[PDB]
Ligand binder design. Structure first.
Ligand SMILES: Cc1cc2nc3c(=O)[nH]c(=O)nc-3n(C[C@H](O)[C@H](O)[C@H](O)COP(=O)(O)OP(=O)(O)OC[C@H]3O[C@@H](n4cnc5c(N)ncnc54)[C@H](O)[C@@H]3O)c2cc1C
Ligand SMILES: Cc1cc2nc3c(=O)[nH]c(=O)nc-3n(C[C@H](O)[C@H](O)[C@H](O)COP(=O)(O)OP(=O)(O)OC[C@H]3O[C@@H](n4cnc5c(N)ncnc54)[C@H](O)[C@@H]3O)c2cc1C
Ligand SMILES: [Mg+2]
Ligand SMILES: [Mg+2]
Lengths: 305, 305
């Protein structure tokens, strides 16, 4: 059995591709992962996804998307793809000890936000810990918060957040910043931003919501506690391109490269959508739009075979 | 009063840009038009917009989007922009005899699908008349339908539709086709497609839904009636770039050109989203994703000023 299309991933990109492919009668086979539903499964209220005047939670939105795909005939499997063979007329994915094949593959594995890896970080996610100023900055009006990171991302998150927050403490584990000089001086010019270099968070405190961070100086080991009600982690993203490295062309940071304004990768019959590709916008609505595009690309490409 | 951003248009691109800009505290001023709400205001059920497991009507979805923008502080005006001055640090839009100014402008005027311009076409829209095989092809299973057009669009719509329809009659007012030879031969190879050249529709019949089309031979004037329950118009699209012609760079078909995978136009501080730019995918979810991108671009650009 060679399917028309296999989709790898179950965030907004993968489920939108599945909805379109299923409605196009392609009978898409979708590997969602065991940690299915994408990044929004791991947040609370989603307010900037257009179509919900009063908002919707991440899990509620993603279940709508999943049920929508099912309604149109998508074959959803809550399992991880462990290896792929993407070159040639028939592509293979390996799922544990099972194999599945298809004429086209849509890559929608997303990107992982890098974690601090400290106690409290996971528990308090959506309760004061965030990875996305655009998404949750809104909810920290007049509060004292921290941003963690030393790159342009962190500089952009910190400066953007000062339009809501009472104060922003920008923490970085070294005394040198990889951020561009322009972003660095923008943050230095901001009166609401204080820098804490050679500093790391060792723990995030909070009974139901974030109440403080435990800090350590990375040179002297001196520890202290800072009272804050928000922690924004901005230490980078890791596109989930491990499966396809060596097969499809990646840029220097591991993002899957695509042709022009399409979803075509360097490999015939292989298409890529979402934050696996996009290192600029990184929103649910942009990932959903790209997943639709990937399925239209795949449909058009299949028609030419 | 110079606003941070003015948005022109109120389809998915314009309302998504408004939601993001308003939530970013930019207080966007949005000119929706008198025919507000975009193309979906002019359809019935929308089934492929991710997030609605049982679907939603076009007007219901667009009202959610409008109310969402309002909730976050967008200033919405149900009026047409009649002229723009887009060059320089301060942009001006003219609305009747009123003027409004802004540092950034987001162009989201969309594209008009070309109409047959015959009696019945407008009345039966969403009741058997469609402009979008991807969107409504689903609903014509085992039915006899027509597709109108002579280009690649029409060839793609007709061939795609044969996976649902019992038959497809492809009508074109000349005996020569502007479609590429590959698309033309794909349709000629399809056993479910019959060509009717030198033929035009003069009227679409239907008590509540489409029941037939009146046909005329464009050479001899011979008229007849065809029994069909669907009409797909695929005679092209006209991007609504009239306002900005001579100011922002357009391609040969009038679409606004953008830089790379961003929404930046040829003019500093001017950004473009949706079907005004995209002549490839033309879906609500892709237009919404691009409107989000336009507002993130605009936010980032404003921050650099
Ligand atoms: C905490 C948090 C809050 C956010 N809040 C918002 C918000 O309010 N608004 C907004 O617009 N955006 C928000 N975002 C961003 C948004 O969630 C992402 O931009 C979007 O989900 C990216 O979609 P994607 O489909 O490309 O990837 P992802 O969402 O990362 O989804 C990819 C999925 O595919 C699975 N997968 C990966 N590899 C495999 C494999 N080999 N086999 C099987 N499955 C696999 C993953 O486990 C994951 O479930 C938030 C992100 C985070 C982390
Ligand atoms: C009948 C029909 C059914 C469809 N069904 C579906 C479907 O089921 N699923 C799907 O994904 N897509 C569907 N589409 C396509 C989808 O509607 C479009 O791709 C999408 O709406 C494009 O969004 P946009 O914001 O770029 O432009 P548009 O939707 O065209 O919106 C632009 C808006 O801006 C206004 N505007 C323009 N110029 C000015 C001005 N000078 N001043 C003020 N306002 C102005 C316009 O009047 C319009 O209201 C359908 C389209 C049609 C025509
Ligand atoms: Mg996840
Ligand atoms: Mg309209």
């Amino acid at each position: 059995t060679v399917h028309d299309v296999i989709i790898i991933g179950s965030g907004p990109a993968g489920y939108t591709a599945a909805i379109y492919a299923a409605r196009a009668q392609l009978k898409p086979l979708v590997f969602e992962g065991t940690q299915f539903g994408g990044a929004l499964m791991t947040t609370t209220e989603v307010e900037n996804y257009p179509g919900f005047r009063e908002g919707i939670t991440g899990p509620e939105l993603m279940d709508q998307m999943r049920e929508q795909a099912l309604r149109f005939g998508a074959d959803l499997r809550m399992e991880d793809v462990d290896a792929v063979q993407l070159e040639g007329p028939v592509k293979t994915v390996v799922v544990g000890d099972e194999t599945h094949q298809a004429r086209a593959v849509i890559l929608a594995m997303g990107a992982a936000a890098r974690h601090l890896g400290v106690p409290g970080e996971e528990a308090l996610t959506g309760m004061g810990v965030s990875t996305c100023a655009t998404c949750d900055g809104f909810f920290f009006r007049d509060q004292d918060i921290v941003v963690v990171g030393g790159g342009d991302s962190a500089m952009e998150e910190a400066t953007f957040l000062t339009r809501f927050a009472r104060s922003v403490t920008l923490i970085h584990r070294r005394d040198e910043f990889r951020a561009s000089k322009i972003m660095l001086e923008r943050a230095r010019a901001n009166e609401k931003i204080t820098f804490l270099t050679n500093t790391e968070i060792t723990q995030i405190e909070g009974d139901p919501k974030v109440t403080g961070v435990r800090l350590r100086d990375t040179v002297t080991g001196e520890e202290s506690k800072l009272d804050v009600t928000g922690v924004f982690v901005a230490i980078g993203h890791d596109p989930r391109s491990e499966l396809v490295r060596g097969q499809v062309e990646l840029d220097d940071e591991g993002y899957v490269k695509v042709q022009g304004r399409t979803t075509y990768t360097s490999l015939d019959g292989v298409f890529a959508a979402g934050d696996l590709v996009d290192h600029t916008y990184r929103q649910a609505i942009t990932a959903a739009g790209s997943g639709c595009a990937a399925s239209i690309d795949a449909e058009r490409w299949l028609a030419e075979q």
